[PDB]
Design an enzyme around this catalytic site. Structure first.
Site, PDB file in Angstrom:
ATOM      1  N   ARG A 177      47.435  53.688 -25.241  1.00  0.00           N
ATOM      2  CA  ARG A 177      48.170  54.268 -24.442  1.00  0.00           C
ATOM      3  C   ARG A 177      49.564  53.839 -24.183  1.00  0.00           C
ATOM      4  NH1 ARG A 177      44.812  50.309 -23.727  1.00  0.00           N
ATOM      5  NH2 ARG A 177      46.205  48.312 -24.030  1.00  0.00           N
ATOM      6  N   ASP A 242      42.911  44.642 -28.281  1.00  0.00           N
ATOM      7  CA  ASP A 242      43.625  45.777 -27.073  1.00  0.00           C
ATOM      8  C   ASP A 242      42.288  45.682 -26.468  1.00  0.00           C
ATOM      9  OD1 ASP A 242      44.009  48.983 -26.014  1.00  0.00           O
ATOM     10  OD2 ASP A 242      45.012  47.568 -25.292  1.00  0.00           O
ATOM     11  N   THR A 243      40.387  45.650 -27.142  1.00  0.00           N
ATOM     12  CA  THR A 243      39.977  46.164 -25.790  1.00  0.00           C
ATOM     13  C   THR A 243      38.950  45.031 -25.614  1.00  0.00           C
ATOM     14  OG1 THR A 243      38.440  46.024 -28.405  1.00  0.00           O
ATOM     15  CG2 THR A 243      39.299  47.844 -27.775  1.00  0.00           C
ATOM     16  N   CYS A 348      30.222  49.531 -33.002  1.00  0.00           N
ATOM     17  CA  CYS A 348      31.478  48.520 -32.325  1.00  0.00           C
ATOM     18  C   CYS A 348      30.843  47.579 -33.365  1.00  0.00           C
ATOM     19  CB  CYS A 348      31.909  48.263 -31.328  1.00  0.00           C
ATOM     20  SG  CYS A 348      32.393  46.578 -31.559  1.00  0.00           S
ATOM     21  N   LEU A 349      31.927  46.808 -34.988  1.00  0.00           N
ATOM     22  CA  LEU A 349      31.034  45.450 -35.387  1.00  0.00           C
ATOM     23  C   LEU A 349      31.514  44.077 -34.763  1.00  0.00           C
ATOM     24  CD1 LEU A 349      32.461  46.761 -38.619  1.00  0.00           C
ATOM     25  CD2 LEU A 349      30.028  46.729 -38.136  1.00  0.00           C
ATOM     26  N   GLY A 350      32.917  44.178 -33.712  1.00  0.00           N
ATOM     27  CA  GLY A 350      33.441  42.965 -33.193  1.00  0.00           C
ATOM     28  C   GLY A 350      32.379  42.890 -31.750  1.00  0.00           C
TER      29      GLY A 350
HETATM   30  C1  HEM Z   1      34.893  44.517 -24.934  1.00  0.00           C
HETATM   31  C2  HEM Z   1      35.670  45.203 -26.837  1.00  0.00           C
HETATM   32  C3  HEM Z   1      35.040  45.965 -27.298  1.00  0.00           C
HETATM   33  C4  HEM Z   1      34.691  47.422 -27.242  1.00  0.00           C
HETATM   34  C5  HEM Z   1      33.932  48.562 -25.776  1.00  0.00           C
HETATM   35  C6  HEM Z   1      35.104  48.129 -28.045  1.00  0.00           C
HETATM   36  C7  HEM Z   1      33.888  49.525 -28.855  1.00  0.00           C
HETATM   37  C8  HEM Z   1      33.705  50.190 -29.877  1.00  0.00           C
HETATM   38  C9  HEM Z   1      33.817  51.346 -29.324  1.00  0.00           C
HETATM   39  C10 HEM Z   1      33.165  52.304 -28.420  1.00  0.00           C
HETATM   40  C11 HEM Z   1      33.687  51.626 -31.013  1.00  0.00           C
HETATM   41  C12 HEM Z   1      33.281  53.248 -31.947  1.00  0.00           C
HETATM   42  C13 HEM Z   1      35.006  54.375 -32.412  1.00  0.00           C
HETATM   43  C14 HEM Z   1      33.684  55.624 -32.911  1.00  0.00           C
HETATM   44  O1  HEM Z   1      32.914  55.371 -32.682  1.00  0.00           O
HETATM   45  O2  HEM Z   1      35.125  56.315 -33.101  1.00  0.00           O
HETATM   46  C15 HEM Z   1      34.554  50.830 -32.025  1.00  0.00           C
HETATM   47  C16 HEM Z   1      34.301  50.815 -33.167  1.00  0.00           C
HETATM   48  C17 HEM Z   1      34.644  49.817 -34.280  1.00  0.00           C
HETATM   49  N1  HEM Z   1      35.586  48.008 -33.384  1.00  0.00           N
HETATM   50 FE1  HEM Z   1      34.852  47.246 -31.909  1.00  0.00          FE
HETATM   51  N2  HEM Z   1      34.848  47.087 -29.327  1.00  0.00           N
HETATM   52  C18 HEM Z   1      35.157  46.142 -28.635  1.00  0.00           C
HETATM   53  C19 HEM Z   1      35.760  45.044 -29.546  1.00  0.00           C
HETATM   54  C20 HEM Z   1      36.346  44.571 -30.491  1.00  0.00           C
HETATM   55  C21 HEM Z   1      36.456  43.656 -31.325  1.00  0.00           C
HETATM   56  C22 HEM Z   1      36.749  42.268 -30.607  1.00  0.00           C
HETATM   57  C23 HEM Z   1      36.986  43.866 -32.372  1.00  0.00           C
HETATM   58  C24 HEM Z   1      37.140  43.232 -33.295  1.00  0.00           C
HETATM   59  C25 HEM Z   1      37.852  43.260 -34.032  1.00  0.00           C
HETATM   60  C26 HEM Z   1      36.012  45.405 -32.751  1.00  0.00           C
HETATM   61  C27 HEM Z   1      36.134  46.017 -34.329  1.00  0.00           C
HETATM   62  C28 HEM Z   1      35.679  47.592 -34.325  1.00  0.00           C
HETATM   63  C29 HEM Z   1      35.728  47.635 -35.138  1.00  0.00           C
HETATM   64  C30 HEM Z   1      36.224  47.756 -36.775  1.00  0.00           C
HETATM   65  C31 HEM Z   1      35.255  49.385 -35.260  1.00  0.00           C
HETATM   66  C32 HEM Z   1      34.588  49.746 -35.774  1.00  0.00           C
HETATM   67  C33 HEM Z   1      33.560  50.315 -36.695  1.00  0.00           C
HETATM   68  C34 HEM Z   1      32.801  51.517 -37.983  1.00  0.00           C
HETATM   69  O3  HEM Z   1      34.138  52.356 -37.148  1.00  0.00           O
HETATM   70  O4  HEM Z   1      31.924  51.317 -38.305  1.00  0.00           O
HETATM   71  N3  HEM Z   1      35.758  46.494 -31.796  1.00  0.00           N
HETATM   72  N4  HEM Z   1      33.948  49.432 -31.315  1.00  0.00           N
HETATM   73 CL1  5CL Z   2      38.839  50.424 -34.600  1.00  0.00          CL
HETATM   74  C1  5CL Z   2      38.229  50.449 -33.637  1.00  0.00           C
HETATM   75  C2  5CL Z   2      38.426  49.512 -32.635  1.00  0.00           C
HETATM   76  C3  5CL Z   2      37.908  49.379 -31.325  1.00  0.00           C
HETATM   77 CL2  5CL Z   2      37.881  47.916 -30.894  1.00  0.00          CL
HETATM   78  C4  5CL Z   2      37.528  51.233 -30.579  1.00  0.00           C
HETATM   79 CL3  5CL Z   2      37.534  50.917 -29.455  1.00  0.00          CL
HETATM   80  C5  5CL Z   2      38.160  51.935 -31.506  1.00  0.00           C
HETATM   81 CL4  5CL Z   2      37.801  53.680 -30.805  1.00  0.00          CL
HETATM   82  C6  5CL Z   2      38.275  51.895 -32.690  1.00  0.00           C
HETATM   83 CL5  5CL Z   2      38.667  53.373 -33.688  1.00  0.00          CL
END
Ligand code: HEM
Ligand code: 5CL
Ligand code: K
Length: 405
Positions: A177, A242-243, A348-350
């Site tokens: 943002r 941030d998420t 999402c890995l997290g």
């Molecule tokens: C409410 C919490 C969260 C939501 C809704 C969320 C949502 C997402 C989404 C929508 C993506 C896909 C992006 C794409 O396909 O371009 C993503 C990827 C990812 N997120 Fe989460 N995220 C959350 C929390 C977290 C947390 C706490 C972490 C830990 C650091 C994390 C780590 C990642 C990583 C490493 C990826 C990339 C996976 C890949 O590209 O294979 N996320 N996340």
């Molecule tokens: Cl690495 C990574 C983590 C989160 Cl949490 C979101 Cl939402 C996106 Cl879009 C990406 Cl690319």
């Protein structure tokens, strides 16, 4: 303002939605994006905003595009194009097959096995922050809980000192943002400038933190490089900073205005995990995209190689063709359909860490501060971007209605 309409884009499919400042924002971000699903809006439209790009408006197309990595590459997942071109975090900017090996390593530092072991830690912090806020009868949820709770957990897992949080959070915010003070490119460079020395010293004297594991890790049998490690840590940083932060605010804002819903989980705590999933659907907040790898006809629309398409993870679950009365929160909803944590090979890995943080919050908060509301007069404001958020959330409660546990 409006980028000139490319010759191949049909005039009638133009819908100038601005993902960084949607028109109906005042009604809430989810509601603002939901305008794309009104009666006369096509399944696929083109907006001339932010440089011009497509936007899939229904879950059907969204899920399809995310499944077809060969046509929809993660190479350029950010809008505007400039940001998308500079975006090189691993594994997010990669498509299978090469993506896999990196995802496996990332999955090792934030995966389920790691989450289960962090349970007690997560509970302790949740209980600590709440038990301290409890007697006060009020709080600014975003800075008193939403941010510190998950961020302190992430910094702990990553082995990074909490004093760096203000700087890091500002950089991540600029990537999702932007306030205009800096481009995605600039914020990325600063994030990397921060990580470089840390990664170097971690490969040198390896520890048990997330950064050390990645930095000293192997990708399908071979040693990861310094640059790859940097790119991966950036993906982890962006994610755990941030998420979850913003999602907790969307959920608490809702609970603060829903005594009936709060009562539900208070009486039957076992409904919390399910409530968490419905909240994840209703208050989905992520929206990034893909870039066409070649000219491709998708659902009757001619997409051109190089074209960018936003595939709002947020919209899937809000789609009425996926969930009846999508805007209504129903903890009993039989089939909670959504793509909140993404869809396809980039799931999402997290998500496991996120669910734990969400459930623990609900359980530990409702158990101590069951009755609370939004501070009067307050006009709660939302903000839109790759990841949407809540500006501020002033809550109030009668200390007498609380209980220590
Ligand atoms: C409410 C919490 C969260 C939501 C809704 C969320 C949502 C997402 C989404 C929508 C993506 C896909 C992006 C794409 O396909 O371009 C993503 C990827 C990812 N997120 Fe989460 N995220 C959350 C929390 C977290 C947390 C706490 C972490 C830990 C650091 C994390 C780590 C990642 C990583 C490493 C990826 C990339 C996976 C890949 O590209 O294979 N996320 N996340
Ligand atoms: Cl690495 C990574 C983590 C989160 Cl949490 C979101 Cl939402 C996106 Cl879009 C990406 Cl690319
Ligand atoms: K790129």
């Amino acid at each position: 303002n409006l980028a000139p309409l490319p010759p191949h884009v049909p005039e009638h499919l133009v819908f100038d939605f601005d993902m960084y400042n949607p028109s109906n924002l005042s009604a809430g971000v989810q509601e603002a994006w939901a305008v794309l699903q009104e009666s006369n809006v096509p399944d696929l439209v083109w907006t001339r905003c932010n440089g011009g790009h497509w936007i899939a408006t229904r879950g059907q197309l969204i899920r399809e595009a995310y499944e077809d990595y060969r046509h929809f590459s993660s190479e350029c997942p950010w809008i505007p194009r400039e940001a998308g071109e500079a975006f090189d975090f691993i594994p997010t900017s990669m498509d299978p097959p090469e993506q896999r090996q990196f995802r496996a390593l990332a999955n090792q530092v934030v995966g389920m096995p790691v989450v289960d072991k962090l349970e007690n830690r997560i509970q302790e912090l949740a209980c600590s922050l709440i038990e301290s806020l409890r007697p006060q009868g009020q709080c600014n949820f975003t800075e008193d809980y939403a941010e510190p709770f998950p961020i302190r957990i992430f910094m702990l897992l990553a082995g990074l000192p909490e004093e760096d949080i203000p700087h890091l959070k500002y950089l991540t915010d600029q990537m999702t943002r932007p306030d205009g003070s800096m481009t995605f490119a600039e914020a990325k460079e600063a994030l990397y400038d921060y990580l470089i020395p840390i990664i170097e010293q971690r490969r040198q004297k390896p520890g048990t933190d997330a950064i050390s594991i990645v930095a000293n890790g192997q990708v399908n049998g071979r040693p990861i490089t310094s640059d790859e490690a940097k790119r991966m840590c950036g993906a982890l940083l962006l994610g755990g900073l941030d998420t979850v932060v913003n999602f907790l605010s969307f959920s608490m804002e809702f609970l603060a205005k829903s005594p009936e819903h709060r009562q539900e989980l208070i009486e039957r705590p076992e409904r919390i995990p399910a409530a968490c999933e419905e909240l994840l659907r209703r208050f989905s907040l992520v929206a990034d995209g893909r870039i066409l790898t070649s000219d491709y006809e998708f659902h009757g629309v001619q997409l051109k190689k190089g074209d960018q398409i936003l595939l709002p993870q947020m919209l899937s679950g809000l789609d009425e063709r996926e969930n009846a009365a999508p805007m209504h929160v129903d903890f009993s909803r039989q089939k909670v359909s959504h793509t909140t944590f993404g869809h396809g090979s980039h799931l999402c890995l997290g998500q496991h860490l996120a669910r734990r943080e969400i459930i623990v919050t609900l359980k530990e908060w409702l158990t101590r501060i069951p009755d609370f509301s939004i501070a009067p007069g307050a006009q709660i404001q939302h903000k839109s971007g790759i990841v949407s958020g809540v500006q501020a959330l002033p809550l109030v409660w009668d200390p007498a209605t609380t209980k220590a546990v």
